[PDB]
Structures are given as structure tokens and as C-alpha cells.
Design a protein around this nucleic acid. Structure first.
Ligand SMILES: O=c1ccc2ccc(F)c3c2n1C[C@H]3CN1CCC(NCc2cc3c(nn2)OCCO3)CC1
Ligand SMILES: [Cl-]
Ligand SMILES: [Mn+2]
Ligand SMILES: [Mn+2]
Ligand SMILES: [Mn+2]
Lengths: 481, 192, 483, 189
DNA sequence: GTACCTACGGCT
DNA sequence: TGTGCGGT
DNA sequence: AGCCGTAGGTACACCGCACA
């Protein structure tokens, strides 16, 4: 009962550091998620909060996640869910929110007692096949529930939505990307394991921010994709236009990713006020729901508007850099990874998911066909089946007699005893036969997939292609030069 | 005011200030409004009942002070209509019984400290749709379309038609004598 | 429209708020003793199956479920209401069984809802008992997506047992808690004599009984409160004078008045000493512990008269506090000042209705089941023909029609037959069905006997109340001293 | 914020430093108030290894601990003025409780080192099954963690002042890389 | 992670 | 030095 | 006075890392 201070510091600090690293601040390379986000989405899945259903109150979603999966504060959970519903934060939003979910001015969401949420349609693709033994479940924090170690993630979410996180001894900053480009990149990789980063860059041009804007040049992108680290220069979308009486204005319609618009405006106001920038006569945020983002900087008559714009870029967040630092959990450990690595781990995850799903579907189809073979024997000899049951004093005796007389398994005998008399009508008998015939065909299709690795790989391609066609959208961020 | 999200125009004749219950409603209102002519002032919950409070308490209350500063008219004897920063002061409480209560508290304050603002027809009551626990439950476009868009909104202009009757109504409903308020409830309550 | 008269706006908006606070927030229903938030909390616990035999469930989750389904208000109002129902210093018969930090007599609040866990107490099962036997009317919830109870069956007199306090609009309420044994004995005496007087009822119900024990001074305040619904009741702490060594003494307080914050009472005594408004006190300590119970010690100066000091403490601090009884509850959905008898009468009438409605529900249910059994007896006695009828039929609609006409069966009987699983054809099932049928006919007769005789129904209410009294009734804690 | 004990004899008095008011309430009810004081601390405490002295002395939680201990700090540290002979760190049993423990030890080691040398600093061992002390009932907290008859307190011992100095600098200091290297060298994934 | 206002009646 | 975001 | 208990609101700290 004596503790050396040095040993205590080392073990307690390591305990904390390791936990923040593998179970808090860093995303998994396979699904792009940290624990709180995974638990929020799993919670939505388990409470049936699909896009075709009505919005559910946020307080309730949060209460459920806290109880069953996430032993931490309600505010960490709610704020994480809120960001997933912000179209200025997530390139492909994962939560469909109803109500005040915050704004680009740093206004927070309304209290969870007011807002409502459900899954977006793309989130269905993160969860698809989760109940087909595609991913390993683990015990939750108190051993009363089960939770997914990782989501099937049928689209490359790490790269699609990006991630940022501050851990201990390290951090991560992965920018979002265009979904059509990423899937084309995965498809190219799938046809050539030895593809180079430069080759992958014919599909994946660079980041694609939800807030659009511009990226200056490709050297920082290239460095980031090659090594996991690189500086990417982002600029607002700004133009110079006339405003009457020989005067001009600078009009900003897109801002850099993660830049608070109100803050950026106050920074300009502060520079004007302190006379650290010349030529500006007015500053207005004309953003509206109907006009979109619109920040106007009026320029003094005869002043060079282009000079003023270059000055705003040097002195304000109108120009901002994104420091790429691609750290993710790979096999449960933090790893700095390049673009190809990120895609390789994602692709392997997809192959495993689709293989496991195919194996699961085969087991369940064989089980069900076995049951239907039992029901078909019962229909073929219904008079005898009835006599056998009627002569039997108990269920146990009837079970044994059915197994003995009709060479049935215990599962088949129990299915026959469970069959309702309505199943004996013409339509119901035909349904039993039709389901069986369809099932034999389905079993044949599954066996083909499992017998040939190229057929499986091709199925992965086809499913990715379908997702690309349904959810892929245009590039927003312009890469200049 | 720190909480005031003012409009661009400085021409009072065309500007409107919307009074909402807090930041939950303020965020939706801020995003949906027309920032050129519509200012928003989120207010911190149940408003001080000025009919029950003495002057020192009233003048030191943060929400009261915000409203006075934002309207720019001064108060009581020093009220100057000509200095009104908005020609429409719009009460936009949440669509619940508590929002109705907040509305009575706000009207009490305007009636006792800014009566000419009411007499001039500058005080309005917004009509957000029912079925929402608060404006923070509404999307910004729904709030704009149903409640703030002048092309579709239905604002109620508050009218003072008999001052003696209004004085008695404010004293009875909002004053310190419980018995008269109990009597009013008993005489008017329809439990159906 | 376009215009709105200020006077009309004020009258209508204020009345809207006042009525809502009165009938759906701050005042308890006379029948179950509950306000909407508490009723929704208990119904929530029942619907999520959070009974005393199941593990504790996270408070945050309970509150989230209540918030979404039944109570469209702040999470803090819900959690704090739940917390109070779990405090043994607040509720004479706690309705919630809490795990974790649920606050103290010193005004410490509960731990954040993220940390605590809760479930129903055993006595709460009595509030909810028979709720699914059409004993009480259900209503639509706030958004039309759920159903909630307008009132609970409340198989014990909860209004009076746990009491209530509420600040509404135009009025308030203050009902003290009572001893459950005494209350049930009072309801029983009343059930045998509609003309019983308040004085006779007081032979059963001696006065309030606080979860915090203590003393009540005299019966005058109690008597008027029971006769009129209003009266002042003087509560006094339990205090004794004892030696502490070397010829010195101390006052030791082991019980304090209901709703008095212990730490604040101690600060008030300390304030009086510091400002020299009381003479003779040399030390003040809170020696309260989980092992020893409440123990507040006030050291007295050698040779000072400890009883004079104690009397001064009663006059100058909350060591003595009054409970202003003001018994307002919702009666037929309207607030009413009620006396002790009127409270018991409405409670007893609620019990008669609950038991009557339950009996009627059980009767409809038993007859429905007897009807089904009749159809199954026919099916089993003619099974070969039943099966061939079904096999020859292309759809179950055709099967249903043939079964009904051929065997003189209702639609419900024919459906039950089509739903019957093959395992129901075993040899001993036909007798098992016959046994249930015979028992059911007897049961129907027993239920019909109850509904045909008001005295038999009334006796069933007495027996059920008596069983609750024997299982949950406990000793009086508050001593009433005369006086 | 301090809920002191009755006794004013430091030799027999103990102060428990707990995580949040949530834990404070259970602790205050379950303790022996004659000899046990409770100081509830608000969240993660300041990392004194990274902070400027002016910020350290101005921090509310740091001030409350100095006032409670009564010994003063640094060069003015007077071990004889200690108001308790047992300063017990009782954080919730998990990774953030572990983190708060390292932060507290950092403060004690850099500002009240003799307190550790004198053997006045202890670590409580609340049961592992509760991710917060506010989840436990007062009696269970008393029995398992605060009752001298059954509790298992760890006495903090300083064995090598040079190795300790390097450890606090490495783990708690501003140089990220040494912390990243320590993690890489010692992590058992 | 917590502390505080308000309505309401009664006594790079 | 302020800010991105999961934690107390 | 300020306390009781359901209601309407919401504001400020701490850790950890890496950018400009
Ligand atoms: O605005 C302010 C301003 C200042 C301030 C100061 C101190 C202070 F403590 C607080 C302050 N506040 C707010 C307040 C802090 N809040 C955090 C969130 C907390 N919510 C609990 C909760 C609800 C749930 C749930 N789980 N947990 O699960 C599902 C149902 O709803 C309630 C207290
Ligand atoms: Cl004496
Ligand atoms: Mn055959
Ligand atoms: Mn509101
Ligand atoms: Mn913890």
C-alpha cells in the first residue's frame, strides 16, 4: 500500500494517453469514425431512426446512446451529432437534423430539448449489412449491451468526410474529399494493387470541402498524399465588381473550410478600425438563405480593389491553410498514412465485409431451406403428420415421433409443430414451395461468389459503383494551377 | 446590446426588430431573416414582471436594459418616439402557453414604460405555427416563410382602444394583489 | 387577422397560461395525488419496464424517454421531479428507488443525470396496478404520437400519504404527508359510514406524519386544517438536553422539521450567535453521519440554563417552523380547496370506479376468451373436417367463410382456428382447453356477482386496501404533543 | 467549496480531493465529518508544468487547495502548518480520473514537494465498476474507500528526485515528441 | 464539467 | 497566441 | 426575507496538439 510517484505517473499517464488515442480522439481507417460518432450512428440504427421515419427528439437519441454505449457527458454526444448534421462541416452529412443546428457564424445548435434528428440516406450505406455478421461486435462498457467494433462503411468515409482530433502525443487532420473521385480511386486500385499515388491522383484531384472555395496549386496536396503530411493553401471565392458611380466592391461567396464567417468579418473590421489596411469604405454580411453566402467589401473610389484583396488574403482568414496530418487507427494502432494506404485498408475492409456477408447469407439460406424441406415433407404427408401429432400426449413425444417417422431433424419437427393451420390453404402451400425454389437459386448464386475471388472482388466493384452513381456529386472546391 | 443581431439599414421606417425567447430560437431566426431590414434580439427566458417590481430592480435587469438600448427611445417621461430605431417591434415568443406568458410580460413592460410605442402602432405579435415546442425546433426557411416573410406572414398590430380599461387590466392580471387575479380566473375559466 | 386589442390579448393570453398552470402543471389531482410531470415519470418507468426486480436504469435515458413521449418541457424539470420522488427526507413513501447521489437534507442537489440510475419502488407498483385493465382513461399525448394516462389507478391514498406543494397562478397548494396505516384505516371507517365526522376520522388520522419525523405542537392547527382545508401546524425539532462533562451541557437535535434545510438552519443559528442575538452558546457542530443519523450539537455555557436557550432557538430559528396547510387539488379537473373528509371521499370514489371498471374489463375479457374456447372445442372435436375445409380453400378468406358456415362459428372463432398451431392437436390439449373453459365459466360467475352487488364491490375495495395496509403500512414517525 | 472536519488536530485529519460536486455529495454524506474533510474540484485541473506562474497562482482550484492545506507554496512551504496529515486524491476510477491524478501529482511535486516527502499524499482506490463517484451510494463509498477499517489507500513515495524530475518534464511538459516517444516505447495495444 | 436569472403564492 | 473537437 | 417546486432561459473553465 505504498506507491512510487514515478511508477504512478508513468502508468496513469500511459493509461490516459492510450485510451484517448485508441478510443476517443482518432478515427478508424476502415469506417472513418471515432467511438462517439460510431455509437451515435449505431444508436440511430437500433432505434430504427431511418430516413423514411419521422424525426426523433435529440434528447431521446442522446439519452439512449449514453445509457447503452457511451459512458460520457450528454454535451459531447449531442455536439458530435450536431456537427454530423451541418452541411458546412460534413462533406456528406451523416445526420438529418430538424431545427436550429448552428451556423457558419459559430452560433451553436438549439438545446437538445428542441431539436430532432434521424439518419441521412447516405448513413444507411455506413450501416448496411451490419446485422449480417460483417463486422465484430464487442461488449459495451458495462457488459449489458453489444456494440459494433467498426461499421461496414460501404463508402470510403474517412476520406469522404475527413477528420480532426487532438489526442495525446499526436493529433490528426484529414481533409474531406469528393465521393465520385474517391470511389473512382478505389475502383482503379482494385484493378491494380501496384498503382502509384500519382496515378491515384488522376481520380482524386485533392480535397473537396463542403464549403467549396479554392485550393492554390497541387504541390501541398501531392506532398500530403505521398507522405501523410502537407500544407494546403485555401482561399475564399472572391470577385471584384462595379457598384455604381465609378466605384467597386469585393464580393466573397465562399469561405475556407472551418473558418468562422462572423469572426473573419470582425477581423477585417478590426484591421480597418486600427487602420492596418487601406481602401475599405464598408463591410457587410449579406448572406441569406435565398442568396447564399455573400460578404461585401466596398472599396474607396479610385483605389485598387485587387491590391486590397491581396492584402485581405495576407492579413485575414480569407486565405487559410489546412495542415494535413493523416493519422488513423490501423489494426487498433495510430499510424501516419499516405493516400494509397488509406485506400488499401478501406478496400480490404470492403472485401472482408462482402465476403462475411456472403458467408452469413449462405448459412441463413441453408438453414431456412432446411426448415422448408421439413414443411414440404409435412405438406406431402399432411394426413400422417396430423395422426402422429394427435396420437401424442405431449409436445416432446410429438417431436420425437415426427423425427422418428419422417426422418426429420429437431429443428424441422419443431417448425412443423409451430405451423399454423392457415399455412395449409392453397395460397400458403404454394408460398412454401415458391420460397424454397427461390432459395435454391439464391444459394447457388452465393456459392459462386465464394468459389471465385474475382467474382467477389467484382461484386465489391459493382456495389461501390452503385453507391457512386446514387450519392456521387460534383466537385465543389476549385483546385487552381 | 451584445445579443442584438442588428439589420444593415439604419432607416427605422423600414426596419423591424424581432424579440425571441433565447438563442435556441435566435439562431433559426438569424439564419432565416432578411438581415437588411430585420434585427433579432434573443431574450433570457421569463421576463421580469415590471408591474410587481420597483424601478431599481427593473433598470438593473439585463433583458430590460437590452430592449431599452436596442429601441433607442428612452423610457417613461423621457420616451422619445422620434428616436425609435425600428418602426416594428415584433414579439415572437414560442408557440406554447409559456410563450403566451412571456408575451403578457413584454406587453406589461411596453405599456408601463413605452406606452407611446404602442399608441403609434409600432408593436406587433408574430404568429409562428403551433405544433412546435419552440422556434429552435423549426428550420430557418420554415420560420422565414410562415412567420417573418412580409409576403406571407400574418403580423398582429397591437391596438390600445381604451386606456382606463388597459390600466385596470394590467393592474389586475400582472399586479401584486392575488385575489383579483384569482377572481378573474374563476369568472373566466372554462374547464372544457 | 391584422389587428389585436391589447386588453383582449392580455386577458386571453394570461388566462391561457393561468389555466394551464392550474390544471396541467402545479396542482395535484385529488385521485392519484400527482402532477403531470410525476405522473409521466411513473408511467414512463412502467412502460419501459423499470420495476423493482429489474436492474437500475440510467437517469438520462429515463428522462430522455419521458421528454420525447410525454412531457414537452425541460430535462431539468423532469430529472429534479424524479430526484425528489427518490428522497426519503422528501417523500413519506418514496416512489422512485435511486442509485447514486440523490441529494441531501443540506440542500446538496443530486449528481448530474449522467451519473445516477433509478427504478420504481415497490409501493409505486400499487399506483400503477390495474392500469392496463381499462380502469382509467387514456388520452393522446402532446403531439398525437402516444397515449398517456389521465390519472393512475392509485391503489393507496397517495395525495394525502406523500402530500404536495405547488405555486400556481391565483392560488397555491400545501398538503402535508400522512401515515399510510392511519390513512387506510380512515378510508375504511369512511367506507362503513358515509356520515362519519372529521373528529371521528381523526380517531384514525391523528395528523400529518413527516418523513423527517419531529414533533407537532398541539391539535388545534391540525383540527382546523382537517375541518376547512386551511390551518397552521407548528413543527418542532426533536431536541434533548444532556451533560457533556465537567458540569457543562449541550442541546442535541436528532430530527428537524419537514422541508427545513439542515445546513441553512445551522447557519441561521450561527448568525444569531455571531450577531449576539442569542445568549449562552459556545459551540455548534453538525455531527450527522450515516451511522448515527441526524445529530446537531449546540454547546451551552457552564451554568447557563439550556432550556431557556433551546426555547429561544425555537422562537428565533427554523428549529421550530410552521406548516401552513392549504389543501387545493384538482377535483373533476378544477382546483378546489378541500377538507380531510372530501379528500378521502374523492379517493374512495376513485377506488370504487377503478375496481368496478377492472371487474367489467375482466368480465369482457373472460367472455371473449370463453367464446374462443368454444370455437376451439368445436375445431378439435371435428379436426379432420376442419383440416379438409382449410386444405380445399385457396385463400384464408375462403377458409374463414367455409369454417363459419359449416361449423356455426363467428369470425373471431374461425380466425383463432386458422391461427392455431399444429402442436395444439396433441392428446392432452383437448382436456386442457376443457379445464380452462370450466374455470372461466366459474370466474365469469364470480365477476358477475361483484357487478350485481354494490356491497360486494365495496367489500372487495376494503379487502384490497387492507392488504396494501398490511404490506406497506408503517409506524408513525412524527410525535403529536398535547399541546 | 471545502466541507471541513470538526477536529482541528492535523495529525488525525484527512482531506479528500474528489472529482466534481456529483462525487462531492456522496462523499460528504458518507464521510466521518469529525476527521474527514472534502474538497470537490471542478474538472481537469491546470497542468502547472505547462502554465505560467501568474496563471497558476490565479487559478481558482489551485487557490482552494493551497488555502485548504494551509502550508503555502514553493519557498514559503511550511510543512508544520499543514492542516491535514493525509491529503487523499480520490478521482473517479477510469482514464480521465487517472489523468486528473497525474495533474494533481504534478502540482504537488512542483509546488508542495515536502508534502510528498513527508508521506502526506495518498491515492484512494474506489471500486472499478462505476465511471464516476456520483453513481455510488454514500455507504458504499464509505465502506470501500473512506473507512479506515476497510479502505486500501496508496501512500505516495518519492524514491529518486532526479528520475521523478525527468518523468514530470517528459509526461507533463511542453515538448510533445518525448511524450510521443514514451507512448510508442511503452504502449501495449 | 458546473451556477444563475426570471414567474408564481404564502407566510497561425 | 487563438482555434479546430472529444473529454471532466 | 427568501424559501418551496415546476416552469422559461442560458456562460464559462480546464486538457491535449499543431497550425498561422
Ligand atoms: O447555459 C448555461 C449557462 C451557464 C451555466 C453554468 C453552469 C451550468 F451547469 C450550466 C450553465 N448553462 C447550462 C448548464 C449546463 N448544462 C449542461 C447540460 C446538462 N444536460 C443534462 C442532460 C440532459 C439530458 C440527458 N443527459 N443529460 O440525456 C437525455 C435527456 O436530456 C444540463 C446542464
Ligand atoms: Cl435545563
Ligand atoms: Mn414423401
Ligand atoms: Mn420557449
Ligand atoms: Mn469518469
Amino acid at each position: 500500500n505504498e506507491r512510487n510517484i514515478t511508477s504512478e505517473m508513468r502508468e496513469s499517464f500511459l493509461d490516459y494517453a492510450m485510451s484517448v488515442i485508441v478510443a476517443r480522439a482518432l478515427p478508424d481507417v476502415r469506417d472513418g469514425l471515432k467511438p462517439v460518432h460510431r455509437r451515435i450512428l449505431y444508436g440511430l440504427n437500433e432505434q430504427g431512426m431511418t430516413p423514411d421515419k419521422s424525426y426523433k427528439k435529440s434528447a431521446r437519441i442522446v439519452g439512449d446512446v449514453m445509457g447503452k454505449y457511451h459512458p460520457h457527458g450528454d454535451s459531447s454526444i449531442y455536439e458530435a451529432m450536431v456537427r454530423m448534421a451541418q452541411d458546412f462541416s460534413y462533406r456528406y452529412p451523416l445526420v438529418d437534423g430538424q431545427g436550429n443546428f448552428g451556423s457558419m457564424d459559430g452560433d451553436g445548435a438549439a438545446a437538445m430539448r428542441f431539436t430532432e434528428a434521424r439518419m441521412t440516406k447516405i448513413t444507411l450505406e455506413l450501416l448496411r449489412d451490419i446485422n449480417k455478421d460483417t463486422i465484430d461486435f464487442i461488449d459495451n462498457y458495462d457488459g449489458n449491451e453489444r456494440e459494433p467494433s467498426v461499421l461496414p462503411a460501404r463508402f470510403p468515409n474517412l476520406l469522404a468526410n475527413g477528420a480532426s482530433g487532438i489526442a495525446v502525443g499526436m493529433a490528426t487532420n484529414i481533409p474531406p474529399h469528393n465521393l465520385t473521385e474517391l470511389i473512382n480511386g478505389v475502383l482503379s486500385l482494385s484493378k491494380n494493387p501496384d498503382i502509384s499515388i500519382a496515378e491515384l491522383m488522376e481520380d482524386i484531384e485533392g480535397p473537396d470541402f463542403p464549403t467549396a472555395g479554392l485550393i492554390l496549386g497541387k504541390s501541398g496536396i501531392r506532398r500530403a498524399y505521398e507522405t501523410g503530411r502537407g500544407s494546403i493553401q485555401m482561399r475564399s471565392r472572391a470577385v471584384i465588381e462595379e457598384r455604381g458611380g465609378g466605384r467597386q466592391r469585393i464580393v466573397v461567396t465562399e469561405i475556407p473550410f472551418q473558418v468562422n464567417k462572423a469572426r473573419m468579418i470582425e477581423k477585417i473590421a478590426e484591421l480597418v478600425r486600427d487602420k492596418k489596411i487601406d481602401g475599405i469604405t464598408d463591410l457587410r454580411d449579406e448572406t441569406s438563405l435565398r442568396t447564399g453566402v455573400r460578404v461585401v467589401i466596398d472599396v474607396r473610389k479610385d483605389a485598387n480593389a485587387s491590391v486590397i484583396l491581396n492584402n485581405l488574403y495576407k492579413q485575414t482568414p480569407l486565405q487559410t491553410s489546412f495542415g494535413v496530418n493523416m493519422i488513423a487507427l490501423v489494426n487498433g494502432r495510430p499510424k501516419l498514412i499516405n493516400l494509397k494506404e488509406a485506400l488499401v485498408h478501406y478496400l480490404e475492409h470492403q472485401k472482408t465485409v462482402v465476403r462475411r456477408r456472403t458467408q452469413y447469407n449462405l448459412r441463413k439460406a441453408k438453414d431456412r431451406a432446411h426448415i422448408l424441406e421439413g414443411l414440404r415433407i409435412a405438406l406431402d404427408h399432411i394426413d400422417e403428420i396430423i395422426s402422429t401429432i394427435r396420437e401424442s400426449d405431449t409436445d416432446k413425444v410429438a417431436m420425437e415421433s415426427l423425427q422418428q417417422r419422417f426422418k426429420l431433424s429437431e429443428k424441422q419437427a419443431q417448425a412443423i409443430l409451430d405451423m399454423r393451420l392457415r399455412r395449409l390453404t392453397g395460397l400458403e402451400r404454394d408460398k412454401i414451395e415458391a420460397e424454397y425454389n427461390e432459395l435454391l437459386n439464391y444459394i447457388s448464386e452465393l456459392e459462386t461468389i465464394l468459389a471465385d475471388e474475382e467474382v467477389l472482388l467484382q461484386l465489391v466493384r459493382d456495389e461501390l459503383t452503385e453507391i457512386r452513381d446514387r450519392f456521387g456529386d460534383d466537385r465543389r472546391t476549385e483546385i487552381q494551377l | 446590446p451584445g445579443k442584438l443581431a442588428d439589420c444593415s439599414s439604419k432607416s427605422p421606417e423600414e426596419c423591424e426588430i424581432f424579440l425571441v425567447e433565447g438563442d435556441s430560437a435566435g439562431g433559426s431566426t438569424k439564419s432565416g431573416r432578411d438581415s437588411r431590414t430585420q434585427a433579432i434580439l434573443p431574450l433570457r427566458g421569463k421576463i421580469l414582471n415590471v408591474e410587481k417590481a420597483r424601478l431599481d430592480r427593473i433598470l438593473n435587469n439585463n433583458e430590460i436594459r437590452q430592449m431599452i438600448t436596442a429601441f433607442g427611445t428612452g423610457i417613461g417621461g423621457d420616451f422619445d418616439l422620434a428616436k425609435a430605431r425600428y418602426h416594428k417591434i415584433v414579439i415572437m415568443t414560442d408557440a406554447d402557453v409559456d410563450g403566451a406568458h412571456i408575451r403578457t410580460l413584454l406587453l406589461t413592460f411596453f405599456y408601463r414604460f413605452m406606452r407611446p410605442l404602442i399608441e403609434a402602432g409600432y408593436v406587433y405579435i408574430a404568429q409562428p405555427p403551433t405544433g412546435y415546442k419552440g422556434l429552435g425546433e423549426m428550420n430557418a426557411d420554415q420560420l422565414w416563410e410562415t412567420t417573418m416573410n412580409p409576403e406571407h406572414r400574418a403580423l398582429l398590430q397591437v391596438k390600445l382602444e381604451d386606456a382606463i380599461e388597459a390600466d385596470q387590466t394590467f393592474e389586475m392580471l400582472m399586479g401584486d394583489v392575488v385575489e383579483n387575479r384569482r377572481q378573474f380566473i374563476e369568472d373566466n375559466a372554462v374547464y372544457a
